[PDB]
Design a protein around this ligand. Structure first.
Ligand SMILES: CC(=O)SCCNC(=O)CCNC(=O)[C@H](O)C(C)(C)COP(=O)(O)OP(=O)(O)OC[C@H]1O[C@@H](n2cnc3c(N)ncnc32)[C@H](O)[C@@H]1OP(=O)(O)O
Ligand SMILES: CC(=O)SCCNC(=O)CCNC(=O)[C@H](O)C(C)(C)COP(=O)(O)OP(=O)(O)OC[C@H]1O[C@@H](n2cnc3c(N)ncnc32)[C@H](O)[C@@H]1OP(=O)(O)O
Ligand code: NA
Ligand code: NA
Ligand code: NA
Ligand code: NA
Ligand code: NA
Ligand code: NA
Ligand code: NA
Ligand code: NA
Lengths: 258, 258, 257, 262
């Protein structure tokens, strides 16, 4: 007897060419569809509308990289400088994505949805519940940006989605109202790009556990770029400078007789 | 006083927003550019033309997934079924990409560029050198497809770039001429999709060591999809069936006294 | 000039690396072993001789479980794809988590919670576990049972009780639960994961270090499988189609955009 | 019809279908009860052979010496980066392990490879060996140290060589060859000593481990340290790491306006 080891629903390569949710890639190309549509097929088994496609495109472009200093890029750079090939080097950087690096996108969407359903018109109760049980509000706050120096990417994304699409964004609207409240207590408690993207993705009807995929995929663009960049330079193996390390170590000691 | 630890050329986040090869992502979005343009900027520090961008788009779409049975997808499925979160699960599948899984794109591009430079009008000489020093020509050959049943994705890509763009494609042209020679020897020695993509990328002036990025990035779309699919099904931990394993092990023996 | 990171366990600025203050060459010359270096780098304390003897056995017993489980099979898939050893083992290690290896840590965590919150209320523990967690980690086996006991559990429990002086409240608690659970169903035995998890908790190791023993031990096996496949010149793996349930969409034409 | 099954994979080293897992035919519980150790399980699973007591003592010392080299090197630092990003231990250690390869750890394998080739191709021709290395490789792997020299040798090398020659009967042709090479190279330049990577690489080759298994000792040993660093960072509740900007040479494009799409 032979029972299947796994079950798949999204793709199939047993036919003439691979099929994404029933559609051939070459036919998707010939009829004008794009990367964003293949994302919808493989992650949601649904061809996105044009307005959804334009938003997916912009989220990925905006999320593609944040410079070499952050953990995902720097992990890929460390591996590149150790002479590791591209896929394995990028896998090391991608391993950094989780609760602290990228997690604000998923978490902001998760809790701003919970606020929409459990505190529809009780923002102080939401902030109060967050203050006791979570701490800082995911998606709110910036070290440099403020009300009079807002994030241009948030401005653009909010402007594009409200002026160039007809999409209903309950979570984003809630976050935008929270921004009005939070900026009162402290001026730098703005809606940041992670909260904006996290709320928009929740409003686009993607499964909750797929939301991290947009950050993972986008930052893979940057991590590949950094691997290529380090290989273009013939970079050498990295050792962190000693003065950058607080060696709070035990004093040198003699091993006791066994 | 402090020698820099690393050098980066492709991106910077010290300004108002991240800059990709000098360009702000929000401004790229507002002026109609896409994911494919961000790929060109971060992997080659050059803005693609519209025709180049259309080709990059199609390469990523065609490469996004090849079903759950191949090593990259299956590695991500194994990790998903072990309860591993999406970024780490995809990183395990990505680790499978290398000389045997995905490697044909890079090798085809490398050797067909060498053919354009060392055998400009000497296809028999190129094929002769390949058999001596390499063996089979990467990008040539297919297990099922043949001259009278070619790969529809190759047909499409070659047709699109020939008829819908004015790009000069010496590597692709060389491969298409080689196809005439090899198919004259054996009907199934057609130009395959890996060879087509590898040659086109070289003709787009991407570095040889960047070619793999297109496969790594594209297959990340599918690996994310498979992770989502397995989580939608609540699949269980996988153990390979014993009848699928040839246990060519030592006979059980008693441990000798020490 | 503010430090980027802070470390407390090791230092290589001297003549040789120092593990919790001790030089490795000196540890070697005075008769210490791998288990002692584990204690220094994970707990900044030299183990007692009995602690080292237990650590040694836990690692030996956990080193491998055959090629069919997710960690080894992940390393084998990577080996057959031509990936080098460290990266191939990294793919197998990525499989270790709540379902593959996690029972060791969870058994330790919940049997500690039972010892402190239900010292003489096993039904309250079993009831609370069934309500809030589900199956008891470390209990149950698909093949082993009262009729087919586990030799490694027999050995480990026997070694602890007859060859050491260690007090093992967590392991003792699990052994009492085993008496209750096996009465319901013969296969609800204390398994090897539960045995090791309880012992590690009883040795006063930090709770978040417990997974290290499984991670380290199975790295031995994953390296072995990588070597084994490379000795055989194995080829790239593709899962057989008949092993996959393709519950996919029907082939469809793409709609005009 | 019915499916005709052909095995997907073949294994020779281990089997869990019996009463307990078998490592090259031996039960771990029985290995434990008869006094064997971690080093013996390493020998079984990587080489399908029970080590002798002296081979086991050498394996033990190699692993202990290789367990960690501080937090600044790439493997440890990768595990630290992932720990400070909140990643769980197995995945964090996997990120540091990904750094191990031709540049980080590779000197052990390269030293073993080329000093065995010297034993087989230049048995009594050290100058010929050095000449070939300069032409085809460059510096001799396992020779040289930036700080240590003949006046300040590596104590771990001294200890390992002393232990093997005074506390065991092992024949170490590769190690012996390297020790003679050291005499020639140190005459050229005082810091061209035999370093710990060359010592371990040669000893492992002399233990009859396959060349492609040599990296296993570094991978396994440094997993001990990488686990330790993950635990250490979690004990401290360290924060997400961002490399300071002044540590980065931003040789980037100037800020530019995006051209209109044509
Ligand atoms: C030796 O190869 P054979 O035993 O002939 O095997 P095979 O049938 O696969 O090869 C037939 C021909 O196609 C060639 N060939 C086979 N596969 C490929 C390939 N992937 N790329 C290019 N040429 C190929 C072989 O070199 C041979 O040509 P030759 O007679 O000029 O040397
Ligand atoms: C740099 O400072 P210099 O004093 O010029 O040293 P340099 O790098 O030129 O090497 C000096 C000598 O040591 C040798 N050498 C340098 N590094 C190594 C090494 N890692 N292993 C072996 N020999 C080495 C060189 O080959 C040269 O010897 P040679 O003249 O016989 O070829
Ligand atoms: Na930056
Ligand atoms: Na709205
Ligand atoms: Na053709
Ligand atoms: Na098995
Ligand atoms: Na390899
Ligand atoms: Na290797
Ligand atoms: Na057996
Ligand atoms: Na853990």
């Amino acid at each position: 007897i032979v029972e299947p080891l796994i079950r798949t629903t999204i793709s199939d390569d047993r036919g003439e060419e691979p099929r994404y949710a029933g559609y051939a890639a070459s036919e998707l190309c010939s009829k004008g569809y794009g990367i964003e549509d293949v994302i919808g097929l493989l992650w949601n088994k649904k061809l996105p509308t044009r307005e959804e496609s334009e938003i997916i495109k912009r989220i990925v472009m905006i999320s593609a990289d944040h410079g070499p200093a952050v953990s995902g890029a720097f992990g890929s750079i460390l591996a590149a400088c150790a002479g590791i090939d591209m896929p394995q080097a990028v896998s090391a950087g991608m391993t950094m994505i989780g609760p602290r690096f990228g997690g604000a996108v998923t978490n902001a969407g998760k809790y701003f949805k919970m606020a929409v359903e459990d505190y529809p018109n009780d923002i102080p109760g939401f902030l109060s519940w967050m203050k006791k049980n979570v701490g800082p509000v995911p998606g709110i706050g910036h070290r440099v940006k403020s009300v009079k120096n807002p994030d241009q990417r948030v401005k653009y994304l909010v402007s594009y989605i409200k002026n160039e699409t007809s999409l209903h964004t309950p979570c984003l609207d809630y976050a935008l109202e929270v921004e009005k409240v939070t900026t009162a207590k402290k001026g730098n408690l703005i809606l940041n790009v992670d909260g904006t993207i996290g709320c928009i993705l929740m409003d686009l009807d993607f499964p909750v556990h797929s939301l991290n995929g947009f950050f993972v995929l986008a930052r893979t663009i940057g991590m590949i770029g950094h691997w290529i960049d380090q290989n273009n330079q013939n970079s050498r193996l990295i050792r962190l400078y000693d003065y950058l390390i607080n060696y709070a170590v035990k004093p040198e000691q003699e091993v006791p007789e066994k």
